[PDB]
Design brief:
The protein is of the alpha+beta class. Helix content is about 30%, strand content about 15%. It is built from eight helices and eight strands. It has a three-stranded antiparallel sheet. The chain has a three-stranded antiparallel sheet with strand order 7-6-8. A two-stranded antiparallel sheet has the order 1-5. Bound molecules: zinc ion (4 copies). The site of one zinc ion (ZN) has 7 residues, from strand 7. This is E3 ubiquitin-protein ligase RING2. It comes from Homo sapiens (Human). It is found in: Nucleus.
Length: about 210
């Protein structure tokens, strides 16, 4: 049920932000390879005018997925969930902005401060951890941050559009693709977060 899906763990109830790297670090971008999270799975090029399925948060070039639906096959090409029409998609300017910085229409080093705005939760001011996306407007937050926020508001923290008339948790989804590209881009973030969890569970055994 919904109550179990978004119940926060003992760790999650006390978690604190993963603070941004602001020291001048540059990350390495390889020539002639893509991060697969930034690749359209239909045309196999970097995403162009990214559109994202509301139900399953899968990304495609706008033209690729609109054309795919005109085959008559009304499903998501990535997971095969039903996809009624292009109104089941939303524009993803965050992915577009990330791509424009990592793959400038082609440098080998990128300042992580240039990427940070696209990888950070505005509620805690740190990097996304268990990124979770409001499906109507495609704004994203840490799981714990948005779950706690929606206990006292039914409106998006960023754009203020009502998430749901009565139960906002119905209209959020875990965003694996966003969290995966965050962990791939931010050095040490996955390692640091898993260490925090291990340290917590060791201090609170059961
Ligand atoms: Zn494409
Ligand atoms: Zn899908
Ligand atoms: Zn957060
Ligand atoms: Zn929003």
């Amino acid at each position: 049920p919904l109550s179990k899906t978004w119940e926060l763990s003992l760790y999650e109830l006390q978690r604190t932000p993963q603070e941004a790297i602001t020291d001048g670090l540059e990350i390495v971008v390889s020539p002639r390879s893509l991060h697969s999270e930034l690749m359209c799975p239909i045309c196999l090029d970097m995403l162009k005018n990214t559109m994202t399925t509301k139900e399953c948060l899968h990304r495609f070039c706008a033209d690729c997925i609109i054309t795919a639906l005109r085959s008559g096959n009304k499903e998501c090409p990535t997971c095969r969930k039903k996809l009624v029409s292009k109104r089941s998609l939303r524009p993803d300017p965050n992915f577009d902005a990330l791509i424009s910085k990592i793959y400038p229409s082609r440098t080998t080093r990128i300042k992580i401060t240039e990427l940070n705005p696209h990888l950070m939760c505005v509620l805690c001011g740190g990097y996304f951890i268990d990124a979770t996306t409001i499906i109507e407007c495609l704004h994203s937050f840490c799981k714990t941050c948005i779950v706690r926020y929606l206990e006292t508001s039914k409106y998006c923290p960023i754009c203020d559009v009502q998430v749901h008339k009565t139960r906002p948790l119905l209209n959020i989804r875990s965003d694996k693709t966003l969290q995966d590209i965050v962990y791939k881009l931010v050095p040490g973030l996955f390692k640091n977060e898993m260490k925090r969890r291990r340290d917590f569970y060791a201090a609170h055994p059961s």
